Design a protein around this motif. Structure first.
Motif, PDB file in Angstrom:
ATOM      1  N   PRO A   1       0.769  -1.334  -0.019  1.00 34.29           N
ATOM      2  CA  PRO A   1      -0.156   0.007   0.043  1.00 34.29           C
ATOM      3  C   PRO A   1       0.967   1.349  -0.199  1.00 34.29           C
ATOM      4  O   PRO A   1       1.941   1.245   0.778  1.00 34.29           O
ATOM      5  CB  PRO A   1      -0.908  -0.059   1.452  1.00 34.29           C
ATOM      6  CG  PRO A   1      -0.857  -1.477   1.759  1.00 34.29           C
ATOM      7  CD  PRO A   1       0.543  -2.116   1.130  1.00 34.29           C
ATOM      8  N   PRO A   2       0.446   2.331  -0.718  1.00 44.22           N
ATOM      9  CA  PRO A   2       1.135   3.671  -0.771  1.00 44.22           C
ATOM     10  C   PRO A   2       1.744   4.329   0.485  1.00 44.22           C
ATOM     11  O   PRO A   2       2.883   4.747   0.333  1.00 44.22           O
ATOM     12  CB  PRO A   2      -0.040   4.389  -1.392  1.00 44.22           C
ATOM     13  CG  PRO A   2      -0.818   3.655  -2.464  1.00 44.22           C
ATOM     14  CD  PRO A   2      -0.816   2.192  -1.628  1.00 44.22           C
ATOM     15  N   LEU A   3       0.869   4.451   1.398  1.00 46.79           N
ATOM     16  CA  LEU A   3       1.242   5.190   2.507  1.00 46.79           C
ATOM     17  C   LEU A   3       2.167   4.358   3.357  1.00 46.79           C
ATOM     18  O   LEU A   3       3.185   4.928   4.033  1.00 46.79           O
ATOM     19  CB  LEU A   3       0.156   5.759   3.534  1.00 46.79           C
ATOM     20  CG  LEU A   3      -0.626   6.944   2.937  1.00 46.79           C
ATOM     21  CD1 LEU A   3      -0.866   7.147   1.485  1.00 46.79           C
ATOM     22  CD2 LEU A   3      -2.075   7.084   3.662  1.00 46.79           C
ATOM     23  N   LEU A   4       1.953   2.823   3.496  1.00 55.77           N
ATOM     24  CA  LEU A   4       2.850   2.235   4.329  1.00 55.77           C
ATOM     25  C   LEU A   4       4.116   1.896   3.411  1.00 55.77           C
ATOM     26  O   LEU A   4       5.086   2.035   4.448  1.00 55.77           O
ATOM     27  CB  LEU A   4       2.358   0.791   4.439  1.00 55.77           C
ATOM     28  CG  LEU A   4       2.897  -0.259   5.332  1.00 55.77           C
ATOM     29  CD1 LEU A   4       2.982   0.266   6.965  1.00 55.77           C
ATOM     30  CD2 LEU A   4       2.177  -1.590   5.420  1.00 55.77           C
TER      31      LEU A   4
ATOM     32  N   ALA B   1       6.200   5.548   4.573  1.00 50.27           N
ATOM     33  CA  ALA B   1       6.559   5.442   5.839  1.00 50.27           C
ATOM     34  C   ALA B   1       7.599   4.497   6.125  1.00 50.27           C
ATOM     35  O   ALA B   1       8.292   4.645   7.012  1.00 50.27           O
ATOM     36  CB  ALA B   1       5.335   5.128   6.765  1.00 50.27           C
ATOM     37  N   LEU B   2       7.625   3.353   5.424  1.00 45.96           N
ATOM     38  CA  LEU B   2       8.735   2.249   5.573  1.00 45.96           C
ATOM     39  C   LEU B   2      10.119   2.390   5.278  1.00 45.96           C
ATOM     40  O   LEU B   2      10.961   2.017   5.730  1.00 45.96           O
ATOM     41  CB  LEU B   2       8.432   0.900   5.049  1.00 45.96           C
ATOM     42  CG  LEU B   2       7.467   0.101   6.164  1.00 45.96           C
ATOM     43  CD1 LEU B   2       6.359   0.901   6.917  1.00 45.96           C
ATOM     44  CD2 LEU B   2       6.297  -0.858   5.123  1.00 45.96           C
TER      45      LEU B   2
END
Lengths: 193, 193
Positions: free
Chosen positions: B152-155, B158-159
């Motif tokens: 997923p985009p946001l994960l 953030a990773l």
């Protein structure tokens, strides 16, 4: 009468309660379902396969506060989600260990994506949103793990009240301390906290 | 050349690194020390006996910030003690699991007694002092356990930064949030926080 996926998992959850994560094996599951090991192997190749499925099902059956409600504050979301994660983990024997020992799956990934989105909409940077969710998850895992594993004067008298509690009030108190910590950080913004 | 207690434990810690908590057995330890199983059984009766000893030694060798220094603030104590507990746990393979799976011993009990005493001298009631130490311990255990087990985009985005970190900055950030949570609770006293 069935080796349908849902029935293998239901039977394995039953078994997990009987024997724990250590004692659970494909050989005992086959014995339990009335089936020869090669028959089961067609369905469930190994214990790692089994435990991956069990982890998913544990969270699919009992982790119903996975997503934040409309109009919900971030504080209430983390509180409710933590509470829900804890109870899901405590439903089966060694449930925390089943959760720990498998990589995240498609649902968890999709669910954590919605949670970061929610957090970011509420003032959180991506890293702090992620840290918040992770820290809550780690605190909750630690607490449950300790509960499912589970004399000096002052420790004696303080233990009076952990006695009358499997761990919930201690978990609940610490959870508020963390959330308040996050509120203060968040509110301070780009200045000295 | 020796089955002296210190050498059994040193050898078992070596083995634990080689094979993990699961793969560690008395049979392999004997193989490693050059000794027959009945010989080892005289010294170490079973794996539970072994793991009890290993848990003690893990914390005896590496958990040097167990006790608060003279003039130290409670905040600094919890920070330093958490940090020390985490590093002690991360020294050996499955170190958190070795810690989890044994009951507390005489040292831990004596050490937690001194910690409650210290906390109570600093404004904390017994229950809140105990909750603080426990919550910090649970958060730290969760974090290490996750590290030692370890789109997923946001994960994805953030990773980026959990990447460049085995877990320390995330652990350190969450630890401050908890301590600040405890400061606020403590300072509010007997009124609405």
């Amino acid at each position: 009468s069935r080796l349908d996926k849902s029935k293998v998992i239901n039977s394995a959850l039953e078994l997990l309660n009987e024997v724990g994560i250590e004692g659970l094996t494909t050989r005992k599951l086959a014995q339990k379902l009335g089936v020869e090991q090669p028959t089961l192997y067609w369905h469930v190749k190994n214990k790692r396969a089994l435990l991956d499925a069990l982890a998913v099902e544990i969270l699919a059956r009992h982790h119903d506060y996975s997503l934040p409600a409309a109009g919900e504050s971030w504080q209430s979301f983390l509180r409710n989600n933590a509470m829900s994660f804890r109870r899901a983990l405590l439903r089966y024997r060694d449930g925390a260990k089943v959760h720990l020992g498998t990589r995240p799956d498609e649902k968890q990934y999709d669910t954590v994506e919605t949670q970061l989105r929610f957090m970011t909409e509420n003032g959180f940077s991506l890293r702090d949103g992620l840290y918040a969710i992770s820290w809550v998850s780690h605190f909750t895992l630690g607490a449950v793990l300790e509960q499912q594993e589970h004399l000096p004067p002052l420790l004696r008298e303080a233990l009076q009240i952990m006695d009358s509690d499997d761990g919930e009030q201690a978990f609940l108190h610490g959870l508020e301390s963390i959330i308040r910590g996050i509120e203060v950080q968040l509110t301070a913004l780009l200045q000295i906290v």
